[PDB]
């Protein structure tokens, strides 16, 4: 399925909000996000069907 | 989350530049069930609905291990990992597996006690240590029965060795409990459905339970949930009347941060900048995940000031006056009495699934506003 | 040539009536409309009766007769005018639909042991709403009794979870099917 | 996909199996002979199931334990069939009536009779094997005193005309079973 996902963030250190769109064309995933778990202080992994989203900022992982 | 091509709006800020998001192409045949993670962050492990096992490295981005379902037993009630992340444990209802990943070999297999179908909970505990040259572990096995198993498990590269040690049998069915290892000593928290908060603690050979004092003012409350910071060995404790922040070992209640009533199964805490100066364990900032009890909006209260505005004398390593002379850059920062901590509101829709960062510094999450077919 | 097109309209009229049986409470008057709208001995006339046998437990005995009569009829006018053409998905479809019909008739002392040996297909595009409604309502009607093999509930629940193809409403509902499958994994 | 050694094993087994079915009609039969058969039959063939369906019918205390394997072989023959079926009328009828027979020997009666009454007996063609005959004989036997009661829609008449036509095309020996069969026709007409 095509999917209009909604990325966003709100820093406490900056007290600031921002956001991004995240298209997902032809995804076989159907499930809601979660269970979630941060993969680091700067980065998080989250369940999305069998697949797992990985997101981060300032990360050395990238 | 595969799609034929993911996309996001082109960034105009360095605030978003380092911000990034990537797939791991490797996957379960079918949707995820449950997972567990190493403290090192380098290691990761996962299981699907098909209960295939997968483990993966985070920084080196290279495959570590894969296991198909038919290699595995029909029942798989539980899962657990060592803090090093160098080894793996699995609980089929009748017998546990212990397998290395970095050096894939059958380190051990061992039958163990169970009382089906009461819900499992599990905790690893590192020994006197000597990795890699020699090792040991202390397998806690919490149960909804309120039984709490503990096992010896000395292990060496020669081949994992095993022996049972003790069977705790705590009163009443349990809401929650967690491991808490101070560098000085092992300790383990234990909430009851009764709301009792016992803690076993390892005085070496001694393994002493102790009755932590939830105090008289709100004893009757159904708890939401206790949560703490094991590296801080500090006990936060949910109540609608105000969370406890009780001390361990020498043990005392300190203070209760002012809060809105909060939904059960929600409470958790995170902190920036771990350090252990002068025996103290101060952190740069603190933050507070929980779903709201009523409005049910996601909520993450913040505390601390910073970047240079404040330093957190969380607890005191010794609740005594002290004059040890070593450099304390934090003294240049303003002292924090509880009064100025000043929570920072940011109520948000539940629909945006989201988590507080482990350091508590940053919010992250997503939701689908909409989706559509190939047509 | 006409009854072909009548069979088409009754086909589309049934595929739409089965998907409404999950959100709303649906009544026999809508099925008998499809049955009379259908032709004498067509393809969709057999599937319509199955829908009746599945969607209405208060009318299973009388319904089971009408199904087995329409099949005892399809067979008589196959030899008397002779090789069968059934695929695995329509085998599993009749398979489950019978066991569900016999649980509703009290012989569940038998209907369980029949449900235990059902060959469940895999994941594919082909999956008519008739076979979905049967596989769903049969999974529900056997989710509690079947524990004393137990492979079917998990395999059958995965059959339902492993597909949709239609807009959510019922987004949290399918997710509830997922979590129920999860606690089924947690058994 | 079968070698050239097991094809002969199946032909040899199929003749011994046919021999045991017709011999079971005028002599006293046992399983000891079927164990030798199924073991002689190669490990994944049609003859396995025929050897099993014969064991299901010819051994009634072993119904429970021989029905196990009849389903096992069929759930296994289905297992590889995907990892389209084409069944014959007489094959359906054979399995149909053989299950009805196995259920009555279990203690279902009602369920055994209703399945029996919905059996679709084939017309009268060349598809007449001693197994299909032995099943229809013993099933007519254990069911003629039960389905003959309710009167309206029954196959008792059609079933007995099947075992008729059957005896005169193959076994051709002799007046023995033919007398009992004509007596069965008497059992139907007098009913």
Swiss-Prot record, chain A:
Please summarize what the entry says happens upon disruption of the gene.
Cells show absence of mature sre1 as well as inability to grow in the absence of oxygen.
- What is the protein's given name? Sterol regulatory element-binding protein cleavage-activating protein
Annotated consequence of substituting residue 32 to K: In Scp1-M5; reduced interaction with sre1
Hey, which family's this protein in? Belongs to the WD repeat SCAP family.
Query: Assembly and partners?
Result: Forms a tight complex with scp1, composed of 4 copies of scp1 and 4 copies of sre1.
Q: Which compartments does it reside in? A: Endoplasmic reticulum membrane; Golgi apparatus membrane
Range of the intact protein held here: 992 to 1053 of 1086
| Species annotation | Schizosaccharomyces pombe (strain 972 / ATCC 24843)
Q: Which domain of life is it from?
A: Eukaryota
Task: State what this protein does.
Answer: Escort protein required for sre1 processing at low sterol as well as oxygen levels. May regulate export of the scp1/sre1 complex from the ER at low sterol or oxygen levels. 4-methyl sterols bound to scp1 may mask an ER export signal in scp1 leading to retention of the complex in the ER.
Curated annotation (Swiss-Prot), chain B:
Location comes to: Endoplasmic reticulum membrane; Golgi apparatus membrane
Region span, Interaction with sre1: 74-375
| Recorded phenotype for the gene knockout or disruption | Cells show absence of mature sre1 as well as inability to grow in the absence of oxygen.
Q: Which residues lie on this side of the membrane: Cytoplasmic?
A: 1-375
Q: Which ranges does the UniProt record give for the WD repeats?
A: 27-66, 71-109, 114-161, 170-210
Subunit structure as annotated in this protein's UniProt entry:
Forms a tight complex with scp1, composed of 4 copies of scp1 and 4 copies of sre1.
Protein name per its UniProtKB record = Sterol regulatory element-binding protein cleavage-activating protein
The beginning of the lineage is: Eukaryota, Fungi, Dikarya, Ascomycota, Taphrinomycotina
Q: Which residues of the full protein are shown?
A: 567 to 941 of 1086
Curated annotation (Swiss-Prot), chain C:
Name a GO molecular-function annotation: protein dimerization activity
What is known about its induction?
Answer: Proteolytic processing to mature form is induced by low oxygen or sterols. The processed form binds to its own promoter to promote positive feedback regulation and ensure maximal activation.
Which of UniProt's keywords are assigned here? Answer: Activator, DNA-binding, Endoplasmic reticulum, Lipid metabolism, Membrane, Nucleus, Phosphoprotein, Steroid metabolism, Transcription, Transcription regulation, Transmembrane, Transmembrane helix
- Tell me what PTMs the record reports for this protein: In low oxygen or sterol conditions, undergoes proteolytic cleavage by rhomboid-type protease rbd2 and is released as soluble transcription factor from the membrane. Processed form is phosphorylated.
Disulfide-bonded cysteines: none
- Phenotype seen when the gene is deleted: Cells fail to grow in the absence of oxygen or sterols.
Q: Name one GO biological process term.
A: positive regulation of transcription by RNA polymerase II
Q: Where in the cell is it found?
A: Endoplasmic reticulum membrane
What GO cellular component entries does it have?
chromatin; cytoplasmic side of endoplasmic reticulum membrane; nucleus; SREBP-SCAP complex
Q: How does it assemble?
A: Forms a tight complex with scp1, composed of 4 copies of scp1 and 4 copies of sre1, which protects sre1 precursor from degradation by the proteasome.
This chain belongs to the protein called: Sterol regulatory element-binding protein 1
Record the organism.
Schizosaccharomyces pombe (strain 972 / ATCC 24843) (Fission yeast)
Q: Which gene encodes it?
A: sre1
Q: Give the residues of the full protein shown.
A: 695 to 888 of 900
